[PDB]
Amino acid sequence: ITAYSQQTRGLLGCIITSLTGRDKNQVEGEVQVVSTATQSFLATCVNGVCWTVYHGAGSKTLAGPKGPITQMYTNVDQDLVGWQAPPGARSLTPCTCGSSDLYLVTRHADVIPVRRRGDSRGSLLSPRPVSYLKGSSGGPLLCPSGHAVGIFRAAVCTRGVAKAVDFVPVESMETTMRSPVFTDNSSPPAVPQSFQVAHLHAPTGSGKSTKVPAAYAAQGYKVLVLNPSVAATLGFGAYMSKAHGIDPNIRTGVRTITTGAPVTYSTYGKFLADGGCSGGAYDIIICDECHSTDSTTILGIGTVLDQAETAGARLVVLATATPPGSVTVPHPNIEEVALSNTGEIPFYGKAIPIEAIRGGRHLIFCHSKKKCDELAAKLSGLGINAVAYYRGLDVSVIPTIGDVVVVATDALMTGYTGDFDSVIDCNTCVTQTVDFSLDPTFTIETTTVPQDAVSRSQRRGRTGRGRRGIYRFVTPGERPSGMFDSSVLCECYDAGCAWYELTPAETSVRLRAYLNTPGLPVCQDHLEFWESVFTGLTHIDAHFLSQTKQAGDNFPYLVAYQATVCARAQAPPPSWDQMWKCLIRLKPTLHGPTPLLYRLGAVQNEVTLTHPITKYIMACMSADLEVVTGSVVIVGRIILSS
Amino acid sequence: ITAYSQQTRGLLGCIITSLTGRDKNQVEGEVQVVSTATQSFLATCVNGVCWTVYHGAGSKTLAGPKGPITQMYTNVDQDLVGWQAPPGARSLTPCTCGSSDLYLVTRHADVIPVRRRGDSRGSLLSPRPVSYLKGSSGGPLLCPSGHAVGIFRAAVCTRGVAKAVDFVPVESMETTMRSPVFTDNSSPPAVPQSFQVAHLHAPTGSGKSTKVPAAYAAQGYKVLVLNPSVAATLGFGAYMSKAHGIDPNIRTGVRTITTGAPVTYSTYGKFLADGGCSGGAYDIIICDECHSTDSTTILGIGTVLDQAETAGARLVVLATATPPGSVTVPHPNIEEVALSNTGEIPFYGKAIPIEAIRGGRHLIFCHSKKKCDELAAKLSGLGINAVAYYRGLDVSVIPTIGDVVVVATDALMTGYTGDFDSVIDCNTCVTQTVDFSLDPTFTIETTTVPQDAVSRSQRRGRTGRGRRGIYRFVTPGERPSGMFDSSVLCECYDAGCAWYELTPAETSVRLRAYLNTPGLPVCQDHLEFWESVFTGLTHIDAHFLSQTKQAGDNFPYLVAYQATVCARAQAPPPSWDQMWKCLIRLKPTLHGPTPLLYRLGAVQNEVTLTHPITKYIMACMSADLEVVTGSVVIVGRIILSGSGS
Ligand SMILES: Nc1cccc2cn[nH]c12
Structure with missing residues (x-):
């Protein structure tokens, strides 16, 4: 196998074609080079279906001969999308009697030898900078005879260097092909004999957390409805009294009411503060707004999925109007x-x-x-x-x-x-993003992004x-x-430590149940990494944690902890902006450089890396870290020939 | 002083206007948001001229009502270009009474206070991350009356945080409108009475390296012709004794001939190997291909400019067909x-x-x-x-x-x-850029960029x-x-140490003459920083140096020095790439994490940061570091307030 590339569109064509959705040029090749306005990557045709990664394509249509082709397959959990290949498009054929010697075709038309190590993994015979694989998401892993084994979706890294690749195997595509594209998730499920997780996708006004819990209670079950909003949880209690003649239990931080009724409304945060599931307490648990990717909801849902079965529940309903x-x-x-x-x-x-x-x-x-x-x-x-x-x-x-x-x-x-x-x-929001910057450790940055x-x-x-x-x-x-950043995982451990007295190990078990449950928002699996770094954050200053908790800014644990380290070295914080205000009174005694553990914002002071906790976190960065690498438009192709 | 933004084109309109070069939308306001295909930045109208930075616009045309508007002013050395504003467009005007409380308008319509600290510098009352200043190039610094004091061109950084801003003063824009819009430089200069640097911009074949120096020697002057290429240099010599009747001196590594004649042809490298100007020797030094941004040429030309007047020359000619x-x-x-x-x-x-x-x-x-x-x-x-x-x-x-x-x-x-x-x-080439990445120190990366x-x-x-x-x-x-990266400054210090027995202080004196001479390719002034780094790289292993010099790859001093530090710690190199082949012999005896000094490629081995040289370089990174922050098309504007703040 060898390869070379052919460009068929420039900037102007690519923008015009993306607006109109009409791509007249004939789709040739089996590997296409594709592009959105923000990103370029690869698509590969197999079994008459043009496949690529969800994290690049999203849910977008493919511009085609008679206009926009809407996706025939979408699976956020496998990071997989497909469009019915336009008439007269070649396909790689699946590889069945698979070799362990695979070849990854990049967007530069390079053919990189890969050794298979499991269903979804492959080691690069010669490690390469991760920057070199970017834009090659959705390209093929080929067995020696040129048949498709999978599509590339992420590099596995040690300190910025890619040593292994993660791919979506061909069998997963066939599973997705044989799955129904249309599934009915609008009605409340019946309560099963043995434990089940189920999904409810329904507009606001269907009564996901008013009518459906009402109906369940009528059949004799105890229901817990979790919601991320205090104002909404409180508000259900009044409505359910008026509209269904149930005076439910209400559990928030600001206010709790126990009536003994068979329906409870709680925040995720108050559910967490109460220590999760009581054994016997509930038969059904409805996780409302499970599209919500804030740390308390993720940790909360993760808790229900870890504990529910063993505390006697028979039904977990994951409910939302906007699923991934x-x-x-x-x-x-x-x-x-x-x-x-x-x-x-x-x-x-x-x-x-x-x-x-x-x-x-x-x-x-x-x-x-x-x-x-x-x-x-x-x-x-x-x-x-x-x-x-x-x-x-x-x-x-x-x-x-x-x-x-x-x-x-x-x-x-x-x-x-x-x-x-x-x-x-x-149409924009402020988000947090982790960079594994190794300067010395990681950086959490705030950006404005498109909604x-x-x-x-x-x-x-x-x-x-x-x-x-x-x-x-x-x-x-x-x-x-339906995707969220690894920095949201960091926040989960942060809150586990600062609020819910969870150990990182404990926090890992709950997040693992969330990640491994399909049909929820998805994220890079970095639990070990984040667990490893919080494990070494020992003997925080109770007093500093208290102020960072009450000030209510983000990362109260990591901030307080850095405060702790700075204060024990009579050293200043990274800077004197509001983030480190928990330290203003100690100022005049604080001198020298900052023993920097990580970057949570601008660092204006000089820094030393000699603190033992900095060295511990730096050692943590050597972990394997899986990073990813208007209509979608074909802008070129990769022609395949050994 | 307050400000808000207005978007006037999206992506599609922007590409269409950049290709046609025709923009009908009328030009409102003083401060435009402009874009190329690759970048976006600001442009500010002062005195009927719409000004922006050379590092953003290049020599590109501006899309206007009747078509592409050619640049009226192009000053690479001030990093300043200007198009004649269309008729009716608003302009700011210069500050009259010299305030020192300034306001920087960013592309986000933020107005940040700045304290003037010099002709072209001002410090940020609130230091900010450089990322927040990027794309605000070409924006105005206003006095409190809303008048133009200069345009923003770069941020002065310590370790990623902007503490000061550099700007092109509004004076330099008068200095520019107060001169001819066209100049010549097409003819060889006449030999002046006392020392002068002159430019010659002439097609190849003009005989800039053959015909013009023959002339000067006909008038009885000693002339030296410096060229980057050993082939071109032998080719001019061989061409002279034939079609011109002078057997010139020839100085190159492979072939050196002393005929006693008054023309001498040398490469910049042999010239540097000879210790530059041998006093009294020449009256005219012609620096051919002075557009070349290889390190040997920059260092040679810099040496000529530092040394030539004090060694008795009367003329230096900076020669090229393709000036900045x-x-x-x-x-x-x-x-x-x-x-x-x-x-x-x-x-x-x-x-x-x-x-x-x-x-x-x-x-x-x-x-x-x-x-x-x-x-x-x-x-x-x-x-x-x-x-x-x-x-x-x-x-x-x-x-x-x-x-x-x-x-x-x-x-x-x-x-x-x-x-x-x-x-x-x-239409592409390989380039090296430096990145002040603090991981732990700096990174020299190789990238394939557009020619x-x-x-x-x-x-x-x-x-x-x-x-x-x-x-x-x-x-x-x-x-x-006409622009080159800071990494090239690094290469000059490396070449100085490795080949030309220049101490870093000596290298700084030569490069400074080069930076300070106008009409030459330009670069960010990172001289103090690079000097500091190399001053700390002492006691290199001469055997490793000799192998990296002979192998011919880039940064042989930086490589040999990292290899030296590793061998002495009995540690492995950053990877077993070709770059580290001078350590292959020692592979079996080398164990543990590498004491990493800087990044010149992929680092695959585990690293330790405790080596004293690593800390010294880390400390050098506290230096003030100045970094920069189809037709060009107007895609929006920043409206400034008319009263109050
Ligand atoms: N589709 C996806 C995007 C980002 C991360 C992951 C992990 N599994 N699927 C993912």
């Missing part, structure tokens, strides 16, 4: 209008006409609190009754009745339950609830849904 | 044919048709050693006479002579002087010399000419 891989569809009640540039109010490069928001109750989503304060002011500058809401502020600042423009972050989503006449959406379909649908769903609404937007873009 | 900022333009003898996907031979995503290269003598430029060998091994399969040439092979592997298709890297253009029927250009105007020009220029030629290519366009 779902796409934003029209809402009959909601008119959608792109923002233009003619308007009095500037808003993320577009404009809001004052007429759109003068009078009425309206919600404008902003990515940051700084922008909420900004817009809430510029709107009082024009005589609108505006109010900012974000983490920290009390929800009471939002008037329950009367005109208002609420300028809010996603904190709104758990603080406040009401709806609005309209929603205006900046995904879950965020778009949750934001838009603040209007149109049983009455007509308007959704105005800055951009129609929408990144793939 | 120069655009490629059609050559009347050469027809340029875009390759397509149709052809028997796959070539960088495109294809070359056989008919196009079967008869005659042709040159195919490929980016690497391995692509040449593959493309030769293939072409000789199809049955053509194909030889590969690249660094480490003999110039004579080429025939003189028969039919031939030579498949070469850029090494060709120092090793070999002949030309061809057609040239096929992949620049100089490279296209010299590659094309191997066809159609006074006859006819065909130039075939994979891609149009160029990145800007």
Whole structure:
């Protein structure tokens, strides 16, 4: 086997073709070079199906001869998507009597020898920089006779150097082919004789956590409904009294009510604080909004999946309206209008006409609190009754009745339950991302990114609830849904340690149950890595943890812990911004460089790497770390010949 | 002073406008958000001129109402370009009363306060990560009255955090509108009465290396001609004694001839090996190919400029056909044919048709050693006479002579002087960049990037010399000419230590003369930093140095030094790549983690950071480090407030 590449499109063609969805050029080759606006990667045809990775393609259509081809297969768990190959497209054929000598074809048309080590793994005969494999996701692993064994999806790394590859095996594709593309998940399942995890995909208004738990209780079962929102959990208790004549148990941090009833509503956080499942307590457990990828929900759901069976439950329902891989569809009640540039109010490069928001109750989503304060002011500058809401502020600042423009972050989503006449959406969110930067250890960085379909649908769903609404937007873009960053795993161990008195080992068991359960949001498996680093964080200063807990910023454990190390070396923190405010009083005694454990923000002080905890975390970085490497458009091909 | 942004084009419109060069949207506001295909940055209108940074725009045209607007001003040394603003567009105007409280407008419409600290520097009241400043190049620094003080060009960094900003002062924009828009430099300068540096920009064949120095020696001056290429240098000497009747002195490694004549032809390397200017010797030094950004040339030219006046010369001539900022333009003898996907031979995503290269003598430029060998091994399969040439092979592997298709890297253009029927250009090359990555120290990475105007020009220029030629290519366009990376500064210090017995302080004096001389290729001024690193690299093993020098690969001092530190700790090298072959002998005795000094490639072994030299280099990374932050197209704007703050 040998290979070379042929480019068939340039920038301009690729953008035009991506907008229209019409690709006229004939699909030749078996390995295609594909591209979205943000990324380029590979697609491989097998058994008449053009396959690639979910983390590159998302749920996007493939531009084709008669216009956009919508995906025939999507499996977020296998990181696999497929489109029916356009008429007259070659296919590699599956490899059955497989060799251990495989060849990986990259986007540079290189043919890299790989030695197979298991269903999904292969060692590179000669290790290479991970940068060299990027853009080759979705290309084939070939057995010696040129038949397909799988498609490449991730490199396995030691300190930035790829030594092994992870792939989606051909058999998994055949399983996905023989799976039903359409499955009915809209009705509540019947309670089985032995334990089952089941999925409920249904709009908000189906009664996922009002009607369906009502109905279960009527058949004699005890039901626990978990929700990420306090305001929503509290609110179910009133509604269920009015609407179904059940006064349920309510468990939040701010407020608990035990009536002895057969239905309990809890936060995930309060469920965690109470130590998880009581044996005997519940028959069914409904995990509502299980699309939610915040650390408390993930840890919470992970706890239910580890413990439920053994505490006597027979049914776990994983419930959401926006499951992984779902796409934003029209809402009959909601008119959608792109923002233009003619308007009095500037808003993320577009404009809001004052007429759109003068009078009425309206919600404008902003990515940051700084922008909420900004817009809430510029709107009082024009005589609108505006109010900012974000983490920290009390929800009471939002008037329950009367005109208002609420300028809010996603904190709104758990603080406040009401709806609005309209929603205006900046279409972006602030996210955290881990870089394995080895300078000295890892970095957690905050970025602004394009929203995904879950965020778009949750934001838009603040209007149109049983009455007509308007959704105005800055951009129609929408990144793939149902994935989250390894930094969310870090947060889970952080919270396990800071709040729920979980050991890292204990936290691993729960997260492992989450990862290994299909049909939930997905993430790189880095449990060992993160467990290993929290295990060495011993003897934290109780007093520092206390302040970082109460200040309520992110990574209270890792921050407090760095504080601890700095304070025991009478040394300053990475910097004097608010992150390290738990240390302001000790300032005048603190001198020299910072013994840096990791980077959670800008580091303005000089640093030393000689602290034994820094050396422990640096040793932790030698772990195997699996990293990944408008219509989708074919921009070239890789022609295959030994 | 407050600001907000307006987006006026998306991706599709932006590509269409960059190709047509026609933009009808009217130009509102003072501060435009502009884009190329690869980057995005700012551009600020002052006094009817729309200004931005050379490192962003290159010599590119701006899309305007009637079509592409050519640049009116191009000053590579100030990193400043300017297009005549369309009629009716708003401009800012200079600050009148000299405030020191400044405001930087970023591409995000943030306004950050800056304290003026010099003609072109100002410190950030709140130090910020450089990432937040990227793409704000070309933005204004405003005084409190909203008037223009300069444009932002770079951030001064300690360990990744911006603490100061560098800007092009509004004076330098007056200094620029107060001069002619066209200059000559097409003629050899007359010899002045006292020392002067002059530029000569003339086509190849002008006889810039043959005809002009003969003239100067006719007037009875001693002249030295420095060239990067040993082949070109022997070729000028051999050409002189024939078509000119002077047997010039020749100085090269392979061949040195002292005839006593008043013309001398040398490479920059032999000149450096000779200890530069031997006082009293020459009146005129011609520095040919002063566009070359190889380390030997930069160091030679720098030596000439530091030493020539004090050694009694009256004229230094900086000579090239492709000066910084120069655009490629059609050559009347050469027809340029875009390759397509149709052809028997796959070539960088495109294809070359056989008919196009079967008869005659042709040159195919490929980016690497391995692509040449593959493309030769293939072409000789199809049955053509194909030889590969690249660094480490003999110039004579080429025939003189028969039919031939030579498949070469850029090494060709120092090793070999002949030309061809057609040239096929992949239009990419290999470059080294440094990354201040703190993992633990710095990284020198090799990447394959798009060629620049100089490279296209010299590659094309191997066809159609006074006859006819065909130039075939994979891609149009160029990145800007006349800029080189900080890694090249590192190479000069390395070469100074390894080959030319220069201490780092001495190397700094030569490179400083080069940076400070205008009209030469430019680079970020990282002299103090690199000097510090090399000053700490003491007691190198002479045997390892001698092997890395002879093997001919890059950074032989940095490699030998890492090898030295490893051998002395009985530790393994970072990997067992070819780069570390001077340690192969010792492999069985070497154990444990490598004391890593810096990253020159993949590091596969475990690493320890406790070695004293590692810490010393880590400490050097606290130095102030200045980093930079189709038609150009306007894709948005930043509206500044009219009253109050
Ligand atoms: N589709 C996916 C994206 C990112 C990570 C993972 C892990 N399994 N599937 C994944």
